[PDB]
Amino acid sequence: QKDVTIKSDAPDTLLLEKHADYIASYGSDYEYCMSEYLRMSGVYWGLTVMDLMGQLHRMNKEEILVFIKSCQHECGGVSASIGHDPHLLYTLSAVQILTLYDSIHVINVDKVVAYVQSLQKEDGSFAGDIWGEIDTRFSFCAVATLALLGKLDAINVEKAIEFVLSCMNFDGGFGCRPGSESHAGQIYCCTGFLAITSQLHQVNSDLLGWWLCERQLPSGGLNGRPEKLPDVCYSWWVLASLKIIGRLHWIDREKLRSFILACQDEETGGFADRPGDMVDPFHTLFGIAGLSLLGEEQIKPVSPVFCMPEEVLQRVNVQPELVS
Amino acid sequence: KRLEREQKLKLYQSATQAVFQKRQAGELDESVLELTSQILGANPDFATLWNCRREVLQHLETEKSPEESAALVKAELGFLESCLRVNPKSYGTWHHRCWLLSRLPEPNWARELELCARFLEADERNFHCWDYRRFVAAQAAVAPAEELAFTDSLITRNFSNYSSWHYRSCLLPQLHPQPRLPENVLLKELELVQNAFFTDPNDQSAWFYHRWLLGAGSGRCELSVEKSTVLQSELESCKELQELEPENKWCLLTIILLMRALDPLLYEKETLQYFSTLKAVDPMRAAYLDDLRSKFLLENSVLKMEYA
Ligand SMILES: CN(C(=O)[C@H](Cc1cnc[nH]1)NC(=O)OCc1ccccc1)[C@@H](Cc1ccccc1)C(=O)N[C@@H](Cc1ccc(O)cc1)C(=O)NO
Ligand SMILES: [Ca+2]
Ligand SMILES: [Zn+2]
Incomplete structure (x- = not known):
């Protein structure tokens, strides 16, 4: 029942030029400084959305490459920013960036592999860093990083699979750890994981597919679990998961497209989490990526698994088979 | 309102700067706990600072008495609860509490279950708190x-x-x-x-x-x-x-x-x-x-x- 009501003067056209301008000018501010702890991911969101729009050249490649090198630590892991601590989240983001730029050997790939390998636990799970937080988010970060480097064989894959499957729930979904409640974010991480490791036959696609399509509210937007407000990014996790399991047609594509377009800021460019709210690069990427999965002509095809242009993944020959 | 944001920024930035400087120096001391408490209150998703607190508490454990270390742990529990009241959906805060409880000699698990009950009264859908409750249920x-x-x-x-x-x-x-x-x-x-x-x-x-x-x-x-x-x-x-x-x-x-x-x-x-x-x-x-x-x-x- 909880939903937004889209006012009738909400944007109903795609404003690609404004979005490119918004991202091109981002970080030229209070919010920028307070999100330094996730800077590497911020850079990934910006570059990926620009590349999906055909505008990657407007970003500063050489500056970003030097920044990434300076964020790899002696253990091989990559931090969010210079001086911060290494983590799987920012290691993935860094590898995705270097893959976009065909510059993987800017960092020490052997040490990245060793870092990822070192974070796997006896039950097959992965910690995010040396402090031991366990979450299926990190199982996905681990295999997505290794897949992009061609080094999936470096971890214990069967045990990693066993752990992820132990996180599958009564409703067909997945949570962060065994016993955790289903959540769209975690479902994206786990279905992406199972795509990468060739285990999608173990998902109950009809059951999970149903739970996912029930995320769509009368406004057209998707929420991330029952009784929550829709958000343009939960919209993305849900759509990518549905695509991975071959069930994207189970949501009303036109109603969702209209909800995503209504989240644009016509004055500044960018997308917000919901109509009328303040935009940010995170929601700009996931709004544009959502539109691409729904088949928007002006945007490059996007990988539902890696949230990167398909043409990039074709180049490195890392293209997981989906359900359909 | 606008001017005060620039006031907060500079304090945030200077404290942040001070913590990092102290860290390279190897000054694992209470001044760091002081500076991070200021920053983590407003910004609990700043993971590196939770890492810094753990490195300081680990270091102080070695060069302090059992009673002094017990006092530090009780102060940490209070700091964590105050952070949770402000943002009950932060991964970093809930993980630090788990890290802390997992290393105590005699943890009071019944008190932790009661904390969970109270947070679940406020938001019965808080998955961080349900996850923490499962952790406590297992440990106890x-x-x-x-x-x-x-x-x-x-x-x-x-x-x-x-x-x-x-x-x-x-x-x-x-x-x-x-x-x-x-x-x-x-x-x-x-x-x-x-x-x-x-x-x-x-x-x-x-x-x-x-x-x-x-x-x-x-x-x-x-x-x-x-x-x-x-x-x-x-x-x-x-x-x-x-x-x-x-x-x-x-x-x-x-x-x-x-x-x-x-x-x-x-x-x-x-x-x-x-x-x-x-x-x-x-x-x-x-x-x-x-x-x-x-x-x-x-x-x-x-x-x-x-x-x-
Ligand atoms: C850490 N994080 C979040 O907690 C966001 C917060 C939010 C989103 N919309 C409104 N607020 N939440 C979030 O990303 O939920 C996604 C998610 C949860 C569990 C598993 C996977 C994804 C966001 C950043 C953010 C902070 C504050 C406000 C907006 C965005 C974030 O970094 N998300 C990660 C999600 C992720 C993490 C790991 C993976 O393996 C896959 C995906 C991301 O997209 N990385 O590239
Ligand atoms: Ca350029
Ligand atoms: Zn969101």
């Missing part, structure tokens, strides 16, 4: 039966029940652990959930859980007299609700699923009729419903072809 060896009673009180006292029904789905198998619930348990659960959705027909969580219970059986040709009678009773009760709430899609779907559970071929006519009504009522799901109907029509052909 709390039995599935006790946690089952907790979920019951939570389900009847108010709504927002998806998280509580989920916890039940994980606890029930543990009370009856197999290498697919026993029928006596299933029948009690069906009764509990049926009450739930006739109390609030708009509560989607009871309907999702009920669909799982309808699958957790032993087959339609293995239907006992009691289970057959219970499912037929649910069927008529759903039809009752359907007259009261003609736009309620959950009841229509559940009618279809019940007829499937009872006798696919005998109810084929009615099943198809209900798909037409449901698609009219829930048009966004029409594609899903067509694929489900196609799957059921395919199962029916296989059942008809099994005829001797």
Whole structure:
């Protein structure tokens, strides 16, 4: 029942030029400084959305490459920013960036592999860093990083699979750890994981597919679990998961497209989490990526698994088979 | 308001700068705990600073007395609780509490379970807190039966029940652990959930859980007299609700699923009729419903072809 009501003067056209301008000018501010702890991911969101729009050249490649090198630590892991601590989240983001730029050997790939390998636990799970937080988010970060480097064989894959499957729930979904409640974010991480490791036959696609399509509210937007407000990014996790399991047609594509377009800021460019709210690069990427999965002509095809242009993944020959 | 943001920034930035400088210097001391407390209060997702607190507490543990270290730990628990009250959905804060409790000589787990209960009173859907409660339950060896009673009180006292029904789905198998619930348990659960959705027909969580219970059986040709009678009773009760709430899609779907559970071929006519009504009522799901109907029509052909 909880939903937004889209006012009738909400944007109903795609404003690609404004979005490119918004991202091109981002970080030229209070919010920028307070999100330094996730800077590497911020850079990934910006570059990926620009590349999906055909505008990657407007970003500063050489500056970003030097920044990434300076964020790899002696253990091989990559931090969010210079001086911060290494983590799987920012290691993935860094590898995705270097893959976009065909510059993987800017960092020490052997040490990245060793870092990822070192974070796997006896039950097959992965910690995010040396402090031991366990979450299926990190199982996905681990295999997505290794897949992009061609080094999936470096971890214990069967045990990693066993752990992820132990996180599958009564409703067909997945949570962060065994016993955790289903959540769209975690479902994206786990279905992406199972795509990468060739285990999608173990998902109950009809059951999970149903739970996912029930995320769509009368406004057209998707929420991330029952009784929550829709958000343009939960919209993305849900759509990518549905695509991975071959069930994207189970949501009303036109109603969702209209909800995503209504989240644009016509004055500044960018997308917000919901109509009328303040935009940010995170929601700009996931709004544009959502539109691409729904088949928007002006945007490059996007990988539902890696949230990167398909043409990039074709180049490195890392293209997981989906359900359909 | 605007000028004060520049006031906060510079204090945030200078404190941040000061912490990093101290860290390279190897000054693992209380000044760092002071600086990080300022920053982590406003910004608990700054993970590197939680790492810094742990490095300082680890270092101070070595060069302080048991009583001084006990004091530091109690101060840490208070700091964590104050951070949680401000932002109860931060991964970093909940993880630091787990890290802290896991290394204590004599942790008070009962106090932690009470913290969870209080946070679940404020937001019954906070998955960070449910996850923490499972951690505490495991560490304290709390039995599935006790946690089952907790979920019951939570389900009847108010709504927002998806998280509580989920916890039940994980606890029930543990009370009856197999290498697919026993029928006596299933029948009690069906009764509990049926009450739930006739109390609030708009509560989607009871309907999702009920669909799982309808699958957790032993087959339609293995239907006992009691289970057959219970499912037929649910069927008529759903039809009752359907007259009261003609736009309620959950009841229509559940009618279809019940007829499937009872006798696919005998109810084929009615099943198809209900798909037409449901698609009219829930048009966004029409594609899903067509694929489900196609799957059921395919199962029916296989059942008809099994005829001797
Ligand atoms: C850490 N994080 C979040 O907690 C966001 C917060 C939010 C989103 N919309 C409104 N607020 N939540 C979030 O990303 O939920 C996604 C998710 C949860 C669990 C598993 C996977 C994804 C966001 C950043 C953010 C902070 C504050 C406000 C908005 C965005 C974030 O970094 N998300 C990660 C999610 C992720 C992480 C790991 C993976 O393996 C896959 C995905 C991301 O997209 N990385 O590239
Ligand atoms: Ca450039
Ligand atoms: Zn969001």
